[PDB]
């Protein structure tokens, strides 16, 4: 559970960065 | 666009459910 | 040039006994 | 340290007469004569390369060289020694030692133990030959760095350097004494 | 001279018998903190260097202390400051330590912090205290990351 939660949190952070990059593009 | 929104939606949903699983394991 | 010195003296500084 | 402390063409002429007499004394000197001739020739051309002022100068120079080769008093041994020492001291070799030193300091930062040990040891020998070289600030910082270096070998090499240097020059040693006597407890 | 004699005596105690110091380590720092709060860098560094030989012991004491104090325990803020300063001061001679510590802090940070922020937005001096705790630990992570200047990608790559 801990490993998978950490995975999901970091993925949410990455996709947040993705939407930032999207807004730039 | 549609990719980043649907990925973020799935991720947040899974993140919520996984958090609940964590809460289930902890105590 | 300060290239590779050991961090402080803790490598070789066996403290003085009394 | 034990040596130092158009006329050039006339000196070349004088040396040629010295060797010319020695040809009579002993064979094989002709080879030396031709060798010196070729070396003067190439050195004038190489300085030529670096113009018309020196073009005219070098064409009289080189023509005189050709003539004088075709041409094959009272000057003797010690004179010849001092002249050739001077003319060598003009060549781009006596002012090379400085450069060499710089090269050595590139070595001190490296990723192999033995090479750095031996470099430090040879430097210790160097300084113990010429004790007035602990003046350049870069070598100072080098020996400090190596005094703090992270390997026992170069550490003992460095302390041996500093100790022999202190021993050689009797006075002026109280400036390295503190950094020296700190190092006794070095595991 | 005091702690010089002390630490030398301790290394003599340790060199014969391997386990002993590793047995009582967290109570050590706790008593040290009580002593300091009775009296008034890298003070704890000597013990840390000594206990670096065993890989499992190294992982052990660190994981126990760090996780127990921060996540659910109402440890003294001064104690948190003391342990944090000691952790930052610690000399590191390998690469396992920053990656391990960063990994676990991140995980706990993630879960705890997320819960905290959602409960505060959904809804409190108790919040102030526990939030102070979590933020200091955050800042430790950030200062560490600045001390190495490594990309979060490389860290998360480590497992």
mmCIF file of C-alpha atoms in Angstrom:
data_model
loop_
_atom_site.group_PDB
_atom_site.id
_atom_site.type_symbol
_atom_site.label_atom_id
_atom_site.label_comp_id
_atom_site.label_asym_id
_atom_site.label_seq_id
_atom_site.Cartn_x
_atom_site.Cartn_y
_atom_site.Cartn_z
ATOM 1 C CA UNK A 1 0.000 0.000 0.000
ATOM 2 C CA UNK A 2 2.794 2.438 0.865
ATOM 3 C CA UNK A 3 4.764 1.736 -2.335
ATOM 4 C CA UNK A 4 1.686 2.111 -4.509
ATOM 5 C CA UNK A 5 0.477 5.294 -2.762
ATOM 6 C CA UNK A 6 3.917 6.853 -3.266
ATOM 7 C CA UNK A 7 3.787 5.839 -6.937
ATOM 8 C CA UNK A 8 0.363 7.436 -7.382
ATOM 9 C CA UNK A 9 1.326 10.670 -5.593
ATOM 10 C CA UNK A 10 4.453 11.113 -7.704
ATOM 11 C CA UNK A 11 2.463 10.384 -10.861
ATOM 12 C CA UNK A 12 -0.058 13.076 -9.893
ATOM 13 C CA UNK A 13 2.876 15.481 -9.462
ATOM 14 C CA UNK A 14 4.250 14.557 -12.896
ATOM 15 C CA UNK A 15 0.869 15.003 -14.627
ATOM 16 C CA UNK A 16 0.485 18.352 -12.832
ATOM 17 C CA UNK A 17 3.819 19.333 -14.381
ATOM 18 C CA UNK A 18 2.425 18.009 -17.673
ATOM 19 C CA UNK A 19 -0.604 20.312 -17.515
ATOM 20 C CA UNK A 20 1.757 23.206 -16.717
ATOM 21 C CA UNK A 21 3.798 22.303 -19.809
ATOM 22 C CA UNK A 22 0.513 22.035 -21.736
ATOM 23 C CA UNK A 23 -0.531 25.548 -20.709
ATOM 24 C CA UNK A 24 2.878 26.773 -21.868
ATOM 25 C CA UNK A 25 2.456 25.009 -25.227
ATOM 26 C CA UNK B 1 -5.356 18.705 -23.518
ATOM 27 C CA UNK B 2 -7.632 15.655 -23.197
ATOM 28 C CA UNK B 3 -4.671 13.365 -22.424
ATOM 29 C CA UNK B 4 -3.382 15.309 -19.411
ATOM 30 C CA UNK B 5 -6.874 15.787 -17.954
ATOM 31 C CA UNK B 6 -7.947 12.134 -18.250
ATOM 32 C CA UNK B 7 -4.583 10.920 -16.895
ATOM 33 C CA UNK B 8 -4.817 13.348 -13.965
ATOM 34 C CA UNK B 9 -8.408 12.236 -13.271
ATOM 35 C CA UNK B 10 -7.476 8.525 -13.175
ATOM 36 C CA UNK B 11 -4.388 9.272 -11.063
ATOM 37 C CA UNK B 12 -6.332 11.321 -8.495
ATOM 38 C CA UNK B 13 -9.052 8.648 -8.286
ATOM 39 C CA UNK B 14 -6.506 5.854 -7.772
ATOM 40 C CA UNK B 15 -4.596 8.070 -5.312
ATOM 41 C CA UNK B 16 -7.780 8.459 -3.249
ATOM 42 C CA UNK B 17 -8.545 4.733 -3.262
ATOM 43 C CA UNK B 18 -4.926 3.819 -2.468
ATOM 44 C CA UNK B 19 -4.981 6.266 0.452
ATOM 45 C CA UNK B 20 -8.063 4.466 1.758
ATOM 46 C CA UNK B 21 -6.198 1.148 1.433
ATOM 47 C CA UNK B 22 -3.325 2.650 3.437
ATOM 48 C CA UNK B 23 -5.742 3.797 6.141
ATOM 49 C CA UNK B 24 -7.167 0.263 6.153
ATOM 50 C CA UNK B 25 -3.726 -1.275 6.716
ATOM 51 C CA UNK B 26 -2.283 1.166 9.273
ATOM 52 C CA UNK B 27 -4.374 0.664 12.422
ATOM 53 C CA UNK C 1 43.739 23.819 -6.550
ATOM 54 C CA UNK C 2 41.885 22.254 -3.604
ATOM 55 C CA UNK C 3 40.929 19.216 -5.726
ATOM 56 C CA UNK C 4 40.532 16.189 -3.359
ATOM 57 C CA UNK C 5 41.109 16.823 0.345
ATOM 58 C CA UNK C 6 39.597 14.612 3.021
ATOM 59 C CA UNK C 7 36.624 16.165 4.839
ATOM 60 C CA UNK C 8 38.049 17.877 7.944
ATOM 61 C CA UNK C 9 40.424 16.060 10.218
ATOM 62 C CA UNK C 10 38.122 13.166 11.268
ATOM 63 C CA UNK C 11 39.944 10.910 8.835
ATOM 64 C CA UNK C 12 43.148 11.225 10.881
ATOM 65 C CA UNK C 13 42.689 13.119 14.153
ATOM 66 C CA UNK C 14 42.714 10.604 17.048
ATOM 67 C CA UNK C 15 42.015 12.945 19.909
ATOM 68 C CA UNK C 16 44.501 13.549 22.671
ATOM 69 C CA UNK C 17 44.188 11.414 25.789
ATOM 70 C CA UNK C 18 44.773 12.676 29.319
ATOM 71 C CA UNK D 1 71.272 28.004 -10.613
ATOM 72 C CA UNK D 2 74.982 27.153 -10.837
ATOM 73 C CA UNK D 3 75.493 28.524 -14.373
ATOM 74 C CA UNK D 4 73.727 31.878 -14.808
ATOM 75 C CA UNK D 5 74.899 33.748 -11.712
ATOM 76 C CA UNK D 6 74.249 41.039 -36.279
ATOM 77 C CA UNK D 7 77.063 40.202 -33.841
ATOM 78 C CA UNK D 8 75.486 36.757 -33.265
ATOM 79 C CA UNK D 9 76.636 35.850 -36.767
ATOM 80 C CA UNK D 10 80.206 36.866 -35.827
ATOM 81 C CA UNK D 11 79.977 34.485 -32.860
ATOM 82 C CA UNK D 12 78.790 31.726 -35.224
ATOM 83 C CA UNK D 13 81.867 32.531 -37.326
ATOM 84 C CA UNK D 14 84.145 32.285 -34.277
ATOM 85 C CA UNK D 15 82.741 28.922 -33.190
ATOM 86 C CA UNK D 16 83.200 27.695 -36.752
ATOM 87 C CA UNK D 17 86.886 28.614 -36.583
ATOM 88 C CA UNK D 18 87.275 26.821 -33.227
ATOM 89 C CA UNK D 19 85.736 23.632 -34.559
ATOM 90 C CA UNK D 20 87.693 24.016 -37.816
ATOM 91 C CA UNK D 21 90.971 23.852 -35.894
ATOM 92 C CA UNK D 22 89.631 20.866 -33.990
ATOM 93 C CA UNK D 23 88.954 19.082 -37.310
ATOM 94 C CA UNK D 24 92.712 19.155 -37.831
ATOM 95 C CA UNK D 25 93.160 17.894 -34.278
ATOM 96 C CA UNK D 26 90.573 15.111 -34.406
ATOM 97 C CA UNK D 27 88.206 13.664 -37.050
ATOM 98 C CA UNK D 28 84.377 13.414 -36.867
ATOM 99 C CA UNK D 29 84.194 17.138 -36.047
ATOM 100 C CA UNK D 30 83.050 17.808 -39.617
ATOM 101 C CA UNK D 31 79.739 16.163 -38.732
ATOM 102 C CA UNK D 32 79.249 18.573 -35.838
ATOM 103 C CA UNK D 33 80.097 21.487 -38.125
ATOM 104 C CA UNK D 34 77.475 20.498 -40.687
ATOM 105 C CA UNK D 35 74.960 19.847 -37.899
ATOM 106 C CA UNK D 36 75.410 23.306 -36.347
ATOM 107 C CA UNK D 37 75.160 24.811 -39.829
ATOM 108 C CA UNK D 38 71.820 23.116 -40.469
ATOM 109 C CA UNK D 39 70.554 24.139 -37.037
ATOM 110 C CA UNK D 40 71.380 27.817 -37.569
ATOM 111 C CA UNK D 41 69.695 27.553 -40.965
ATOM 112 C CA UNK D 42 66.459 26.115 -39.609
ATOM 113 C CA UNK D 43 66.419 28.494 -36.632
ATOM 114 C CA UNK D 44 66.670 31.563 -38.863
ATOM 115 C CA UNK D 45 63.857 30.185 -41.043
ATOM 116 C CA UNK D 46 61.698 29.380 -38.003
ATOM 117 C CA UNK D 47 62.110 32.878 -36.577
ATOM 118 C CA UNK D 48 61.393 34.228 -40.075
ATOM 119 C CA UNK D 49 58.017 32.443 -39.979
ATOM 120 C CA UNK D 50 57.053 34.379 -36.795
ATOM 121 C CA UNK D 51 58.106 41.030 -42.925
ATOM 122 C CA UNK D 52 60.074 42.494 -45.822
ATOM 123 C CA UNK D 53 62.616 44.076 -43.427
ATOM 124 C CA UNK D 54 63.385 40.695 -41.877
ATOM 125 C CA UNK D 55 62.989 39.121 -45.324
ATOM 126 C CA UNK D 56 65.970 41.147 -46.557
ATOM 127 C CA UNK D 57 67.806 40.455 -43.307
ATOM 128 C CA UNK D 58 67.275 36.700 -43.524
ATOM 129 C CA UNK D 59 68.158 36.552 -47.210
ATOM 130 C CA UNK D 60 71.532 38.119 -46.446
ATOM 131 C CA UNK D 61 71.749 35.816 -43.405
ATOM 132 C CA UNK D 62 70.997 32.660 -45.411
ATOM 133 C CA UNK D 63 73.201 33.690 -48.342
ATOM 134 C CA UNK D 64 76.041 34.252 -45.876
ATOM 135 C CA UNK D 65 75.328 30.814 -44.431
ATOM 136 C CA UNK D 66 75.563 29.184 -47.901
ATOM 137 C CA UNK D 67 78.785 31.078 -48.642
ATOM 138 C CA UNK D 68 80.344 30.239 -45.294
ATOM 139 C CA UNK D 69 79.559 26.542 -45.687
ATOM 140 C CA UNK D 70 81.346 26.734 -49.043
ATOM 141 C CA UNK D 71 84.248 28.437 -47.181
ATOM 142 C CA UNK D 72 85.194 25.145 -45.343
ATOM 143 C CA UNK D 73 91.804 33.087 -35.310
ATOM 144 C CA UNK D 74 93.509 32.283 -31.946
ATOM 145 C CA UNK D 75 90.185 31.442 -30.221
ATOM 146 C CA UNK D 76 90.440 28.577 -27.744
ATOM 147 C CA UNK D 77 88.585 26.052 -25.549
ATOM 148 C CA UNK D 78 87.062 27.986 -22.612
ATOM 149 C CA UNK D 79 86.000 30.777 -24.977
ATOM 150 C CA UNK D 80 84.147 28.232 -27.084
ATOM 151 C CA UNK D 81 82.472 26.857 -23.952
ATOM 152 C CA UNK D 82 81.166 30.270 -22.916
ATOM 153 C CA UNK D 83 80.004 31.285 -26.417
ATOM 154 C CA UNK D 84 78.077 28.077 -27.015
ATOM 155 C CA UNK D 85 76.588 28.344 -23.515
ATOM 156 C CA UNK D 86 75.349 31.839 -24.423
ATOM 157 C CA UNK D 87 73.981 30.833 -27.843
ATOM 158 C CA UNK D 88 72.255 27.868 -26.206
ATOM 159 C CA UNK D 89 70.825 30.219 -23.570
ATOM 160 C CA UNK D 90 69.257 32.073 -26.490
ATOM 161 C CA UNK D 91 67.607 28.880 -27.795
ATOM 162 C CA UNK D 92 64.010 27.922 -26.780
ATOM 163 C CA UNK D 93 65.188 25.285 -24.299
ATOM 164 C CA UNK D 94 66.727 27.086 -21.314
ATOM 165 C CA UNK D 95 63.402 28.850 -20.732
ATOM 166 C CA UNK D 96 61.451 25.594 -20.567
ATOM 167 C CA UNK D 97 61.828 24.580 -16.893
ATOM 168 C CA UNK D 98 59.088 27.011 -15.820
ATOM 169 C CA UNK D 99 56.636 25.403 -18.285
ATOM 170 C CA UNK D 100 57.564 21.941 -16.987
ATOM 171 C CA UNK D 101 56.642 22.928 -13.427
ATOM 172 C CA UNK D 102 53.130 23.882 -14.580
ATOM 173 C CA UNK D 103 52.724 20.428 -16.148
ATOM 174 C CA UNK D 104 53.603 18.779 -12.834
ATOM 175 C CA UNK D 105 50.861 20.637 -11.016
ATOM 176 C CA UNK D 106 48.296 19.182 -13.406
ATOM 177 C CA UNK D 107 49.304 15.741 -12.121
ATOM 178 C CA UNK D 108 48.565 16.404 -8.450
ATOM 179 C CA UNK D 109 44.829 16.126 -9.046
ATOM 180 C CA UNK D 110 44.435 12.636 -10.477
ATOM 181 C CA UNK D 111 42.693 9.320 -9.873
ATOM 182 C CA UNK D 112 45.628 6.991 -9.208
ATOM 183 C CA UNK D 113 47.589 6.767 -5.993
ATOM 184 C CA UNK D 114 51.100 5.711 -7.078
ATOM 185 C CA UNK D 115 51.504 8.457 -9.682
ATOM 186 C CA UNK D 116 50.665 11.179 -7.160
ATOM 187 C CA UNK D 117 53.019 9.637 -4.573
ATOM 188 C CA UNK D 118 55.922 9.568 -7.010
ATOM 189 C CA UNK D 119 55.181 13.078 -8.281
ATOM 190 C CA UNK D 120 55.255 14.376 -4.727
ATOM 191 C CA UNK D 121 58.490 12.527 -3.973
ATOM 192 C CA UNK D 122 60.250 13.859 -7.071
ATOM 193 C CA UNK D 123 59.047 17.358 -6.197
ATOM 194 C CA UNK D 124 60.557 16.888 -2.745
ATOM 195 C CA UNK D 125 63.836 16.062 -4.461
ATOM 196 C CA UNK D 126 63.451 19.121 -6.749
ATOM 197 C CA UNK D 127 62.930 21.552 -3.878
ATOM 198 C CA UNK D 128 65.755 20.016 -1.847
ATOM 199 C CA UNK D 129 68.024 20.803 -4.789
ATOM 200 C CA UNK D 130 66.927 24.456 -5.191
ATOM 201 C CA UNK D 131 65.656 25.642 -1.782
ATOM 202 C CA UNK D 132 64.417 29.036 -3.062
ATOM 203 C CA UNK D 133 61.373 27.703 -4.931
ATOM 204 C CA UNK D 134 58.766 27.712 -2.132
ATOM 205 C CA UNK D 135 57.659 31.158 -3.250
ATOM 206 C CA UNK D 136 55.155 30.555 -6.049
ATOM 207 C CA UNK D 137 51.718 30.534 -4.406
ATOM 208 C CA UNK D 138 50.335 27.686 -6.532
ATOM 209 C CA UNK D 139 52.941 25.184 -5.310
ATOM 210 C CA UNK D 140 52.228 26.366 -1.756
ATOM 211 C CA UNK D 141 48.524 25.620 -2.106
ATOM 212 C CA UNK D 142 49.461 22.333 -3.771
ATOM 213 C CA UNK D 143 51.542 21.103 -0.855
ATOM 214 C CA UNK D 144 48.820 22.242 1.558
ATOM 215 C CA UNK D 145 46.158 20.310 -0.373
ATOM 216 C CA UNK D 146 48.355 17.232 -0.460
ATOM 217 C CA UNK D 147 48.997 17.669 3.259
ATOM 218 C CA UNK D 148 45.234 17.326 3.703
ATOM 219 C CA UNK D 149 44.964 14.646 0.987
ATOM 220 C CA UNK D 150 42.996 11.435 1.654
ATOM 221 C CA UNK D 151 45.685 8.746 1.315
ATOM 222 C CA UNK D 152 48.458 7.824 3.765
ATOM 223 C CA UNK D 153 51.157 7.517 1.082
ATOM 224 C CA UNK D 154 51.017 11.048 -0.300
ATOM 225 C CA UNK D 155 50.627 12.270 3.275
ATOM 226 C CA UNK D 156 53.977 10.825 4.319
ATOM 227 C CA UNK D 157 55.556 12.099 1.099
ATOM 228 C CA UNK D 158 54.301 15.631 1.752
ATOM 229 C CA UNK D 159 55.424 15.695 5.368
ATOM 230 C CA UNK D 160 58.853 14.441 4.304
ATOM 231 C CA UNK D 161 59.113 17.265 1.760
ATOM 232 C CA UNK D 162 58.126 19.889 4.304
ATOM 233 C CA UNK D 163 60.484 18.493 6.929
ATOM 234 C CA UNK D 164 63.542 18.320 4.694
ATOM 235 C CA UNK D 165 62.843 21.845 3.419
ATOM 236 C CA UNK D 166 62.649 23.064 7.014
ATOM 237 C CA UNK D 167 65.889 21.279 7.866
ATOM 238 C CA UNK D 168 67.817 22.717 4.906
ATOM 239 C CA UNK D 169 67.169 26.429 5.432
ATOM 240 C CA UNK D 170 67.921 26.873 9.173
ATOM 241 C CA UNK D 171 66.073 30.113 9.890
ATOM 242 C CA UNK D 172 62.619 31.061 8.533
ATOM 243 C CA UNK D 173 61.286 27.670 9.654
ATOM 244 C CA UNK D 174 58.936 28.956 12.386
ATOM 245 C CA UNK D 175 56.324 29.677 9.686
ATOM 246 C CA UNK D 176 55.846 26.008 8.796
ATOM 247 C CA UNK D 177 56.423 24.677 12.323
ATOM 248 C CA UNK D 178 52.803 25.067 13.408
ATOM 249 C CA UNK D 179 51.321 23.295 10.381
ATOM 250 C CA UNK D 180 54.065 20.695 10.816
ATOM 251 C CA UNK D 181 53.637 19.828 14.488
ATOM 252 C CA UNK D 182 49.872 19.701 14.099
ATOM 253 C CA UNK D 183 50.242 16.523 12.046
ATOM 254 C CA UNK D 184 51.630 14.048 14.653
ATOM 255 C CA UNK D 185 48.194 12.515 15.289
ATOM 256 C CA UNK D 186 47.516 11.170 11.814
ATOM 257 C CA UNK D 187 46.377 7.556 12.448
ATOM 258 C CA UNK E 1 38.688 17.553 27.475
ATOM 259 C CA UNK E 2 35.494 16.097 29.006
ATOM 260 C CA UNK E 3 33.944 14.629 25.892
ATOM 261 C CA UNK E 4 37.409 13.877 24.526
ATOM 262 C CA UNK E 5 38.038 11.518 27.434
ATOM 263 C CA UNK E 6 34.450 10.277 27.178
ATOM 264 C CA UNK E 7 34.541 9.446 23.466
ATOM 265 C CA UNK E 8 37.959 7.796 23.753
ATOM 266 C CA UNK E 9 36.646 5.638 26.593
ATOM 267 C CA UNK E 10 33.626 4.764 24.461
ATOM 268 C CA UNK E 11 35.725 3.616 21.510
ATOM 269 C CA UNK E 12 37.612 1.414 23.953
ATOM 270 C CA UNK E 13 34.287 -0.006 25.197
ATOM 271 C CA UNK E 14 33.210 -0.651 21.618
ATOM 272 C CA UNK E 15 36.294 -2.187 19.980
ATOM 273 C CA UNK E 16 35.999 -5.434 21.951
ATOM 274 C CA UNK E 17 32.254 -6.083 21.933
ATOM 275 C CA UNK E 18 30.505 -5.469 18.614
ATOM 276 C CA UNK E 19 26.852 -5.178 19.572
ATOM 277 C CA UNK E 20 26.798 -2.998 22.661
ATOM 278 C CA UNK E 21 26.486 0.588 21.396
ATOM 279 C CA UNK E 22 24.045 -0.467 18.693
ATOM 280 C CA UNK E 23 21.726 -1.774 21.421
ATOM 281 C CA UNK E 24 20.956 1.584 23.053
ATOM 282 C CA UNK E 25 20.967 4.414 20.542
ATOM 283 C CA UNK E 26 17.631 6.244 20.570
ATOM 284 C CA UNK E 27 17.578 6.539 24.363
ATOM 285 C CA UNK E 28 21.093 7.934 23.943
ATOM 286 C CA UNK E 29 20.011 10.923 21.890
ATOM 287 C CA UNK E 30 16.899 11.406 24.048
ATOM 288 C CA UNK E 31 18.991 11.620 27.214
ATOM 289 C CA UNK E 32 21.435 13.877 25.357
ATOM 290 C CA UNK E 33 18.553 16.235 24.570
ATOM 291 C CA UNK E 34 17.404 16.200 28.190
ATOM 292 C CA UNK E 35 20.977 17.051 29.210
ATOM 293 C CA UNK E 36 21.081 19.987 26.800
ATOM 294 C CA UNK E 37 17.753 21.270 28.107
ATOM 295 C CA UNK E 38 19.294 21.003 31.570
ATOM 296 C CA UNK E 39 22.471 22.853 30.554
ATOM 297 C CA UNK E 40 20.793 25.827 28.883
ATOM 298 C CA UNK E 41 28.089 21.571 15.242
ATOM 299 C CA UNK E 42 28.119 17.788 14.673
ATOM 300 C CA UNK E 43 28.075 16.930 18.388
ATOM 301 C CA UNK E 44 26.611 13.465 17.721
ATOM 302 C CA UNK E 45 28.885 12.872 14.709
ATOM 303 C CA UNK E 46 31.327 10.602 16.547
ATOM 304 C CA UNK E 47 28.704 7.985 17.429
ATOM 305 C CA UNK E 48 27.260 8.252 13.921
ATOM 306 C CA UNK E 49 30.649 7.531 12.386
ATOM 307 C CA UNK E 50 31.147 4.619 14.791
ATOM 308 C CA UNK E 51 27.817 2.962 13.961
ATOM 309 C CA UNK E 52 28.322 3.176 10.212
ATOM 310 C CA UNK E 53 30.069 -0.206 9.869
ATOM 311 C CA UNK E 54 26.998 -2.458 9.931
ATOM 312 C CA UNK E 55 24.564 -1.946 7.068
ATOM 313 C CA UNK E 56 21.471 -3.345 8.827
ATOM 314 C CA UNK E 57 22.159 -1.554 12.118
ATOM 315 C CA UNK E 58 22.628 1.652 10.115
ATOM 316 C CA UNK E 59 19.286 1.299 8.395
ATOM 317 C CA UNK E 60 17.656 0.189 11.673
ATOM 318 C CA UNK E 61 18.376 2.934 14.198
ATOM 319 C CA UNK E 62 17.776 5.650 11.596
ATOM 320 C CA UNK E 63 14.445 4.253 10.370
ATOM 321 C CA UNK E 64 13.221 3.688 13.940
ATOM 322 C CA UNK E 65 14.068 7.143 15.290
ATOM 323 C CA UNK E 66 13.051 9.169 12.227
ATOM 324 C CA UNK E 67 9.712 7.462 11.669
ATOM 325 C CA UNK E 68 8.675 7.179 15.328
ATOM 326 C CA UNK E 69 9.343 10.808 16.201
ATOM 327 C CA UNK E 70 7.807 12.566 13.194
ATOM 328 C CA UNK E 71 4.664 10.687 12.118
ATOM 329 C CA UNK E 72 2.410 10.224 15.152
ATOM 330 C CA UNK E 73 4.294 11.220 18.316
ATOM 331 C CA UNK E 74 3.968 14.553 20.102
ATOM 332 C CA UNK E 75 7.714 14.941 20.463
ATOM 333 C CA UNK E 76 9.084 18.228 21.743
ATOM 334 C CA UNK E 77 9.638 20.856 19.062
ATOM 335 C CA UNK E 78 13.034 21.546 20.618
ATOM 336 C CA UNK E 79 13.732 17.807 20.352
ATOM 337 C CA UNK E 80 12.732 17.923 16.690
ATOM 338 C CA UNK E 81 15.093 20.852 16.153
ATOM 339 C CA UNK E 82 17.924 19.037 17.938
ATOM 340 C CA UNK E 83 17.502 15.816 15.950
ATOM 341 C CA UNK E 84 17.086 17.751 12.691
ATOM 342 C CA UNK E 85 20.265 19.772 13.212
ATOM 343 C CA UNK E 86 22.150 16.619 14.153
ATOM 344 C CA UNK E 87 20.889 14.827 11.041
ATOM 345 C CA UNK E 88 21.881 17.702 8.753
ATOM 346 C CA UNK E 89 25.320 18.005 10.387
ATOM 347 C CA UNK E 90 26.018 14.268 9.951
ATOM 348 C CA UNK E 91 28.950 13.530 7.629
ATOM 349 C CA UNK E 92 28.101 11.086 4.881
ATOM 350 C CA UNK E 93 30.767 8.867 3.376
ATOM 351 C CA UNK E 94 28.567 6.737 1.103
ATOM 352 C CA UNK E 95 25.536 7.115 -1.177
ATOM 353 C CA UNK E 96 23.095 4.719 0.515
ATOM 354 C CA UNK E 97 22.245 7.107 3.353
ATOM 355 C CA UNK E 98 20.777 10.144 1.502
ATOM 356 C CA UNK E 99 18.819 7.965 -0.893
ATOM 357 C CA UNK E 100 17.390 5.781 1.887
ATOM 358 C CA UNK E 101 16.457 8.704 4.132
ATOM 359 C CA UNK E 102 14.992 10.692 1.217
ATOM 360 C CA UNK E 103 12.958 7.697 0.063
ATOM 361 C CA UNK E 104 11.287 6.993 3.410
ATOM 362 C CA UNK E 105 10.747 10.683 4.337
ATOM 363 C CA UNK E 106 9.075 11.203 0.934
ATOM 364 C CA UNK E 107 6.699 8.241 1.420
ATOM 365 C CA UNK E 108 5.605 9.236 4.939
ATOM 366 C CA UNK E 109 5.484 12.926 3.934
ATOM 367 C CA UNK E 110 3.191 12.034 1.014
ATOM 368 C CA UNK E 111 0.618 10.089 3.010
ATOM 369 C CA UNK E 112 0.587 12.188 6.220
ATOM 370 C CA UNK E 113 0.709 15.572 4.448
ATOM 371 C CA UNK E 114 -2.040 14.640 1.981
ATOM 372 C CA UNK E 115 -4.330 13.529 4.829
ATOM 373 C CA UNK E 116 -3.482 16.708 6.751
ATOM 374 C CA UNK E 117 -4.239 19.121 3.893
ATOM 375 C CA UNK E 118 -7.511 17.428 2.949
ATOM 376 C CA UNK E 119 -8.699 17.406 6.560
ATOM 377 C CA UNK E 120 -7.875 21.102 7.001
ATOM 378 C CA UNK E 121 -9.615 22.098 3.755
ATOM 379 C CA UNK E 122 -12.606 19.878 4.586
ATOM 380 C CA UNK E 123 -12.784 21.604 7.981
ATOM 381 C CA UNK E 124 -7.376 24.116 15.731
ATOM 382 C CA UNK E 125 -4.140 24.769 17.625
ATOM 383 C CA UNK E 126 -3.536 20.997 17.376
ATOM 384 C CA UNK E 127 -3.370 21.565 13.617
ATOM 385 C CA UNK E 128 -0.833 24.352 14.191
ATOM 386 C CA UNK E 129 1.505 22.086 16.192
ATOM 387 C CA UNK E 130 1.381 18.989 13.976
ATOM 388 C CA UNK E 131 1.683 21.212 10.897
ATOM 389 C CA UNK E 132 4.814 22.825 12.355
ATOM 390 C CA UNK E 133 6.234 19.314 12.749
ATOM 391 C CA UNK E 134 5.495 18.217 9.207
ATOM 392 C CA UNK E 135 6.761 21.481 7.695
ATOM 393 C CA UNK E 136 10.095 21.292 9.516
ATOM 394 C CA UNK E 137 10.562 17.752 8.176
ATOM 395 C CA UNK E 138 9.689 19.013 4.686
ATOM 396 C CA UNK E 139 12.346 21.712 4.988
ATOM 397 C CA UNK E 140 14.871 19.085 6.088
ATOM 398 C CA UNK E 141 14.154 17.169 2.891
ATOM 399 C CA UNK E 142 14.557 20.343 0.833
ATOM 400 C CA UNK E 143 17.815 21.392 2.517
ATOM 401 C CA UNK E 144 19.199 17.880 1.990
ATOM 402 C CA UNK E 145 18.229 18.035 -1.685
ATOM 403 C CA UNK E 146 20.046 21.350 -1.933
ATOM 404 C CA UNK E 147 23.097 19.881 -0.194
ATOM 405 C CA UNK E 148 23.353 17.241 -2.904
ATOM 406 C CA UNK E 149 21.720 19.142 -5.800
ATOM 407 C CA UNK E 150 20.360 15.907 -7.273
ATOM 408 C CA UNK E 151 17.278 15.561 -9.442
ATOM 409 C CA UNK E 152 14.178 14.037 -7.845
ATOM 410 C CA UNK E 153 14.082 11.637 -10.817
ATOM 411 C CA UNK E 154 17.431 10.077 -9.842
ATOM 412 C CA UNK E 155 16.283 9.753 -6.221
ATOM 413 C CA UNK E 156 12.943 8.134 -7.120
ATOM 414 C CA UNK E 157 14.899 5.856 -9.470
ATOM 415 C CA UNK E 158 16.632 4.415 -6.417
ATOM 416 C CA UNK E 159 14.724 1.666 -4.650
#
